[PDB]
Design a protein around this nucleic acid. Structure first.
Ligand code: NA
Ligand code: NA
Ligand code: NA
Ligand SMILES: [Zn+2]
Lengths: 147, 243, 936
RNA sequence: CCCCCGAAGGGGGUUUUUUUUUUUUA
């Protein structure tokens, strides 16, 4: 929501004469968008322990279950939670595993990569929907200039 | 800009890429102030950790009939850095995030369920700071909790690893933490399983796994150190108590 | 106190006090001591065992020679331990191939040198990095070794501690290498040691004299006229805070080395600085601080040609003097002047020159003082001490400038290297490349290892679905197959590296499909690699008249990346859908695989196009591209473009000529689509990365550069140019036509372009969007994309275009503004230097041809002075300076009319008054005598 | 369900600053 909003947002054009600035309503000058450098997207993995805690701490054959984008019913019953933020530059923007059920490192890595697979789709979707919005706005203007 | 990593493979402090800072710990340092306690030095990091409990809940709220309540208080003193901070840190969102992180870390390690209707208060004072402070907090908590005789499944070793270009640097100090992205790890015992995984700045995905690899290893060493202290402190205070 | 640790390790606490401006802050750090620091000697047996691998799992190479240079007793088997000062003063001798073969560089020395001079530190690090059989430089971390680490005593300055640390380093070295008998010589100039319980301590000159080849290198070491001494730091900063003084970089006049100027922010024109004293030992390009002179000493811009060879109070009133300076700068002939009072920064690179015959004495066997005349005619002559004067007499040499005291009329310097006899191809070429700091050394093996292991045996995969080829390259699936396209390349006859290739085919829409295909260099060069580093350092390929200095190794440029015909080659392809009016209705950017059907020359392509017997589909596509290019160019002309093709001249005598490129329609054909490509790519990559897009802009010039020229014009030709808009200047240029001389117009366009500002590379975040505009091309945005083999800008733009289309995630190094800033400044400097080098080489060679072969050429007087004229031979695009002595006998009688731009003189060969105006068509001839361009 | 009694009753779940434009190019 925050990213799509920031990319959709436009501040009014302005110009500056020393001490003073001149701010414009839409009729005066067109608004200009903000400077977006990259598009960070978060994916949240939920971890469930199917067996006992003893198996998690000192047991082989890790049975720890991981799911993506848990519902409220799932979120209320989870034993662990990881949030990974990535962008289309294959950058790990951030990672947060603030405690919870101990998970094997390799599993967490796999989570990161699958998350990337998802943020590709989501990013392309955001860009697409944005451009469609702008195009529809333009075509509306074209419908307004001539009845 | 300066040689964070020289071609010779040395750092500013004179360490190599895979070497921990000086790590020393002391147990039962405040017997009159808390049930468990630890004083810890990691590099220039100096931390006092106090564990009070298990004890009767202050309020007759905050009482859980099935398990103990675990609270963590992190006091970052104004004199921990070179430049004194005119502002307190106690209610900063960073500190709250750290506190909740440590709590949710040791909720899954400490057997709270065998201490129902009790409260375990963890009181931490960071006397001196020099980067990698999160892992230090983790280690201090582990030591102090073990000193308190409070049951837990295993050690939790905290460590930090920076990423300079292609090469990862183990246990970063303050200068290294700046001008570099760092990963903090909370590793359970000798396992490969992570209690904590913290990345707060941008890192190339394809190089993240490698950073973890050394990190875990480092953490293991840290465990071996903490362990090594405890046993000694045990061996000393179980022999002298005899006769 | 220090603590011992687990594995031969230790720790202490380095405590000190940092003094940031206006404050005090005590700093505490942990200093670890070690027992595994290698001496890096091939003779040592103990150290290779205790050594440990780095982060790459690598055991540091022991490179110091088992048998070093051996001297006379009490010195045998010696290594050299340097001091900071010795490095700072003799850095250029430390680089000399025939001395200092085995040198130990202590860590603390490295740090000191770094603190006092970063470039010298970079050169020293370069020495330690490129160590081989010829030269061996190592770095020893004496500070991290417990064996050598000394701790600071109370009440002792940092210097004593540093030198005691170097001393302890030398001591440990002697004690460590003595079982083999390797001694160490601490070379220093600072009176370090009062006899204590030792080490060989010799100064620089002393160590030089103990050498076998002393006479060769003895003079490669730094050593009532009175300049006003520079102001103090407190005085100049105080003067800057009060607005009394002004800082900026000084540019010396092109034809007068004693007239300079400084660009100032609020001043309309750059403030003049005239005379030796006012210049005050400043050099061209130096960053200086200047003070405004009284109106009493304001001067008109000099009309004199002067060479180093031909040259023997109240504050309020000061700022109001700045006011008067501005207001007189706008409207007065006599411009306000200034004087330099402090040098903030100094170029002082190595300078190529030649000894002046006047100052030498062949008879004298003893050391003597001689003068060297530098190639750069904006610089003074330098004083050198030597005994090899009679040997260096007619040889191009390299010198270094050490200092310029107030007592000396000229700067003091020392000899560095002999490049060869004058008028030697090798000597003049190397001198030329050195004068413009062009890297011409061969690529290192670390670079050659970045090349594909296949080599020339590299092939583009036949089928792209090949599980093997995709196993080696996943991104290959996005690569589009355009091998069905009839693609051809058009280039000069001497061409070897093909960057561009074009195609055109008709669409059922009635529209045109036009493909511009560029060498996919990105696929071979990767960020971080040594190849990309050397390719980044070399901003572009430098093109001399005989030789070409490549940016990338040949294998890439001559073969793998080049769009050679008849073979499959990878490319980055810009495909267009055009209207018949050549308006863009569609555009796509795809990485592709192609196969060029033909590699045409310009006149080959033109011939084939005009040839009506050939009607093959390829030829049809070429004709299409032609007419489309014509339409594009018309649209750009109406847009207000100011494009001007300069004469391209190359030679190739090939044994023991001056071929001239002709103007053909195919030139336009290629040019227009290259432009289109660069534009589209610019827009796309800017849309992708709006902050770090690799772009190229051309700023609009102030009216000054132009109305000196305009002044000349309507003074003599009764013509003018409008500077209001690009199109204004364009059509006002179209107005400028002489009836009896059809070529004059193009000349006007040449000088006009010379008035314009320099174009520059930049990342998009550094400027606002309306500053992206390219004033010359009359477009809002532009970059370079079409030539990645020979420019690094195209490489960056290629990577960013790859990132734009989702083919591959853009490198971090092109997403960080600082690194890109460094890159842009570097490629700007390298581009400019390449241009200068090219022009210089052309001038030299053309001069040599006109001299060897008695030849008459046409020329145009483009500048007039009272003691010389500067003419332009147009067919070479070459300008030259004719001196009055040379131009005429009896120069004292000659008259200079500044308003009419006229020089009246009597020609030497036989007399009759001759008036020479600016813009005059003259006949030029070349004969070279000494004590040279000439007028026919 | 634990607690007594004896053979059922009573009580209890916890309210950082290491120091001259452009294009193709041997
Ligand atoms: Na652990
Ligand atoms: Na280790
Ligand atoms: Na080569
Ligand atoms: Zn040794």
């Amino acid at each position: 929501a925050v990213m799509a909003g920031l990319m959709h947002f436009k501040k009014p054009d302005i110009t500056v004469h020393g001490e003073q600035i001149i701010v414009h309503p839409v009729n005066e000058r067109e608004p200009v968008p903000l400077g977006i450098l990259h598009i960070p997207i978060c994916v949240t993995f939920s971890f469930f322990n199917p067996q006992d805690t003893e198996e998690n701490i000192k047991g082989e054959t890790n049975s720890e279950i991981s799911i993506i984008d848990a519902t409220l019913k799932e979120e209320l019953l989870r034993d662990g939670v990881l949030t990974v933020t990535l962008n289309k530059n294959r950058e790990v923007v951030q990672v947060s595993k603030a405690g919870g059920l101990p998970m094997d490192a390799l599993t967490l890595m796999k989570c990161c990569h699958e998350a990337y697979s998802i943020i590709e789709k989501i990013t392309d979707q955001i860009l697409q929907l944005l451009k469609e919005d702008s195009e529809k706005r333009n075509k509306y203007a074209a419908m307004l200039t001539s009845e | 800009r300066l040689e964070i990593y020289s071609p010779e493979g040395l750092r500013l402090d004179g360490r190599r890429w895979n070497e921990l800072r000086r790590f020393e710990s002391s147990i039962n340092t405040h017997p009159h102030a808390a049930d468990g306690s630890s004083y810890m030095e990691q590099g220039n990091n100096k931390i006092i950790t106090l564990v009070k409990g298990p004890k009767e809940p202050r309020l007759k709220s905050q009482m859980d009939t099935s398990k103990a309540l675990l609270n963590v208080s992190v006091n970052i003193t104004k004199f921990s850095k070179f430049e004194r901070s005119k502002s307190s840190h106690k209610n900063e969102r960073r500190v709250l995030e750290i506190q909740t992180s440590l709590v949710r870390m040791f909720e899954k390690n400490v057997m709270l369920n065998i201490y129902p209707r009790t409260v375990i208060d963890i009181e931490i004072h960071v006397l001196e700071q020099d980067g990698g402070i999160m892992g230090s907090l983790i280690n201090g908590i582990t030591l102090a909790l073990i000193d308190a005789g409070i049951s837990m499944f295993d050690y939790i070793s905290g460590i930090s690893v920076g990423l300079y270009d292609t090469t990862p640097l183990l246990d970063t100090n303050s200068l290294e933490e700046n001008a570099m992205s760092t990963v903090t790890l909370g590793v359970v015992g000798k396992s490969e399983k992570l209690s904590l995984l913290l990345v707060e700045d941008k890192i190339p995905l394809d190089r993240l796994e490698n950073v973890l690899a050394i990190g875990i290893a480092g953490a293991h060493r840290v465990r071996d150190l903490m362990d090594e202290e405890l046993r000694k402190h045990a061996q000393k205070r179980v022999s002298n108590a005899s006769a | 106190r220090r603590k011992r640790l687990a594995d031969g390790l230790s720790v202490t606490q380095k405590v000190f006090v940092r003094s940031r401006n206006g404050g005090a802050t005590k700093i505490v750090r942990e200093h670890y001591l070690r027992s595994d620091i290698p001496c890096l000697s091939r003779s040592c047996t103990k150290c290779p065992q205790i050594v440990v691998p780095d982060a790459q799992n690598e055991l540091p190479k022991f490179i110091l020679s088992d048998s070093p240079l051996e001297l006379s007793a009490p010195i045998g088997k010696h290594y050299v331990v340097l001091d900071t000062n010795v490095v700072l003063q003799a850095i250029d001798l430390l680089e000399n191939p025939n001395c200092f073969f085995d040198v130990i560089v202590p860590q603390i020395v490295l740090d000191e040198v770094r603190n006092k001079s970063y470039p010298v530190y970079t050169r020293l690090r370069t020495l330690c990095r490129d160590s081989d059989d010829h030269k061996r430089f190592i770095v020893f971390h004496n500070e991290f070794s417990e064996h050598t680490f000394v701790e600071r005593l109370p009440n002792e300055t940092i210097n004593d501690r540093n030198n005691r640390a170097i001393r302890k380093t030398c001591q440990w070295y002697s004690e460590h290498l003595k079982p083999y008998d390797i001694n160490v010589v601490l070379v220093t100039n600072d009176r370090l040691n009062r006899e204590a319980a030792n080490i060989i301590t010799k100064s620089l000159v002393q160590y030089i004299e103990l050498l076998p080849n002393a006479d060769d290198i003895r003079d490669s070491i730094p050593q009532d006229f009175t300049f006003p001494e520079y102001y103090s730091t407190a005085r100049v900063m105080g003067g800057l805070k009060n607005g009394v003084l002004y800082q900026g970089n000084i540019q010396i006049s092109e034809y007068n080395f004693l007239e300079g100027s400084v660009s100032l922010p609020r001043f309309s024109k750059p403030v003049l600085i005239v005379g030796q004293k006012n210049l005050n030992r400043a050099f061209n390009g130096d960053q200086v601080i200047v003070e405004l002179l009284p109106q009493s000493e304001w001067k008109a811009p000099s009309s004199i040609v002067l060479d180093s060879e031909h040259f023997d109070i109240s504050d309020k009133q000061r700022r109001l003097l700045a006011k008067d300076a501005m207001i007189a700068q706008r409207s007065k002939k006599i411009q306000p002047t200034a004087k330099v009072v402090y040098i903030q920064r100094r170029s002082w690179r190595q300078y190529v020159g030649q000894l002046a015959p006047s100052s030498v004495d062949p008879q004298s066997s003893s050391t003597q003082n001689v003068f060297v005349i530098l190639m750069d005619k904006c610089l003074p002559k330098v004083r050198i001490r030597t005994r090899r004067a009679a040997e260096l007499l007619d040889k191009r040499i390299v010198i270094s400038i050490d200092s310029w005291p107030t007592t000396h009329k000229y700067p003091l310097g020392h000899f560095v290297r002999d490049l060869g006899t004058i008028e030697s191809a090798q000597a003049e070429t190397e001198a030329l490349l050195l004068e413009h700091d062009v890297e011409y050394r061969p690529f290192s093996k670390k670079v050659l290892e970045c090349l594909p292991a296949e080599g020339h045996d590299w092939k583009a995969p036949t089928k792209l679905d090949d599980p093997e080829a995709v196993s080696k390259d996943p991104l290959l699936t996005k690569r589009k197959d355009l091998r069905d396209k009839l693609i051809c390349s058009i280039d000069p006859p001497g061409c070897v590296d093909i960057n561009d290739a074009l195609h055109a085919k008709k669409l059922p829409n009635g529209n045109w499909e036009v493909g511009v295909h560029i060498a996919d260099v990105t696929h071979f060069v990767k960020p971080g690699t040594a190849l990309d580093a050397e390719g980044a350092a070399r901003g572009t390929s430098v093109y001399l008249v005989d030789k070409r200095i490549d940016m990338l190794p040949m294998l890439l440029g001559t073969d793998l990346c080049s769009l050679k015909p008849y073979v499959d080659r990878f490319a980055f392809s810009v495909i267009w859908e055009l209207d018949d009016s050549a308006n863009i209705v569609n555009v796509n950017f795809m990485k592709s695989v192609i196969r060029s059907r033909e590699a045409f020359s310009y006149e080959q392509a033109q011939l084939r196009i005009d040839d009506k017997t050939q009607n093959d589909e390829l030829t049809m596509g070429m004709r299409a591209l032609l007419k489309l290019s014509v339409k594009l160019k018309q649209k750009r002309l109406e847009a207000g473009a100011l494009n001007l093709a300069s004469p391209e001249v190359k030679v190739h005598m090939d044994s023991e000529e001056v071929e001239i490129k002709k103007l053909l329609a195919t030139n336009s054909l290629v040019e227009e689509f290259m432009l289109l490509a660069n534009i589209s790519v610019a827009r796309k990559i800017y849309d992708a990365f709006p902050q770090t897009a690799m772009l190229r802009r051309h700023a609009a010039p102030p009216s000054t550069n132009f109305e000196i020229l305009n002044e000349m014009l309507n003074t003599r030709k009764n013509m003018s140019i409008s500077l209001e808009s690009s199109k204004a200047l364009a059509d006002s240029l179209d107005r400028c036509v002489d009836p009896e001389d059809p070529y004059f117009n193009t000349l006007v366009r040449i000088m006009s372009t010379r008035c314009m500002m320099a174009a520059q590379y930049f990342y998009s975040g550094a400027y606002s969007y309306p500053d992206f505009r390219h004033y010359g091309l009359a477009v809002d945005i532009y970059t370079h994309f079409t030539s990645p083999i020979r420019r690094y800008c195209d490489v960056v733009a290629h990577r960013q275009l790859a990132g734009a289309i989702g083919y591959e995630p853009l490198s971090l190094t092109h997403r960080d503004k600082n690194k890109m800033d460094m890159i842009c400044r570097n490629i700007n400097r390298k581009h400019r230097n390449a241009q200068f080098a090219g022009r210089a080489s052309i001038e030299y060679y053309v001069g040599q041809v006109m001299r060897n072969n008695e030849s008459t050429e046409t020329g145009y007087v483009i500048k007039v002075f009272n003691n010389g004229i500067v003419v332009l031979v147009p067919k070479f695009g070459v300008e030259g300076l004719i001196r009055l002595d040379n131009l005429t006998e009896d120069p004292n009688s000659a008259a200079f009319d500044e308003v009419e731009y006229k020089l009246t003189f009597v020609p030497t060969n036989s007399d009759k008054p001759r008036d020479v105006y600016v813009f005059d068509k003259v006949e030029v001839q070349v004969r070279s005598v000494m004590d040279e361009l000439l007028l026919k």
